[PDB]
């Protein structure tokens, strides 16, 4: 699965001087492998998104169509995947 675009979200857009929500083009090619990522907080079931966007060539994301955080009880959850807007849906399977 080829990643040309990701959902973009930045909760810290005001401080970071970015836009809040949009589509982020991942400028890939045949020799430039790209991924999407999602990062969030989980306060006893309540999900607060921190950031969503494009992610550079990372072996942790290879051939992952689903965005899954597999680390046990992190402070800030992270996942990465391949395919357009794959970071819109994310989950936690420790």
């Amino acid at each position, epitope marked *: 699965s080829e990643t040309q675009e990701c959902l973009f979200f930045n909760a*810290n857009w005001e*401080k*970071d*001087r970015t836009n809040q929500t949009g589509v982020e083009p991942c400028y890939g090619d045949k*020799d430039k492998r790209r991924h999407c*990522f999602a*990062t969030w907080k989980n306060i006893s079931g309540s999900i607060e998104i*921190v*950031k969503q*966007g*494009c*992610w*550079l*060539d*990372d*072996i*942790n994301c290879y051939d992952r169509t689903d965005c899954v955080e597999k680390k046990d009880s*992190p*402070e*800030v*959850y*992270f996942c990465c995947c391949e395919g357009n807007m794959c970071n819109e849906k994310f989950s936690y399977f420790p």
Partner: antibody
Amino acid sequence: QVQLVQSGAEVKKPGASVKVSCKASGYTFTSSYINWVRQAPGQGLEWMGTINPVSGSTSYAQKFQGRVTMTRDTSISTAYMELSRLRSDDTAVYYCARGGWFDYWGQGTLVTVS
Amino acid sequence: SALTQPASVSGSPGQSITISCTGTSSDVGSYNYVNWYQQHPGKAPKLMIYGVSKRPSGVSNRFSGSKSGNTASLTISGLQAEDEADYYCGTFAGGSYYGVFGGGTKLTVLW
């Protein structure tokens, strides 16, 4: 182009701390990891640890656990590596590098421990 | 776990030469994540080869990478004076993966 611009050389005494800075430009800072490596005079490259700038999560090499702190400020695309309880054999050039492949390196920061 | 490299190699101009990087079955033998860095004296390392055999843009095609068992190898063809430097092997560092560099190999071009 892609650039990792580091802070200037530092001279420290044993027992003190050093904080090295690494500014990223020519790419989106939050699109990849920042790795830290050091090299003692005339010796080999040694991995220190990695920071994930979007989660703020870190992994440190066993050798530096308890002494190293890696942080970042996404608003200014800067990663920081602080090394505490300095000893003379901490005299080395400290590098930051982009991503899991270390595809781009900073110019290095010489930290001398006298 | 440690990556073992020979301390040094010497070649004549125009020849081919190999630099090896040996790990174990659970690291080099299991993953395609071995990278090669060139470092000139007083300069920062430069990525030559990543993911065993992938070459970044702007890197001469005289540089090639391969693996067999627990050993990854960097091959330099058409050996030039400018190739004289230190070569380090390393593994991907991020997420689940912890970094490790080989001891480095000093390459000498014999005149």
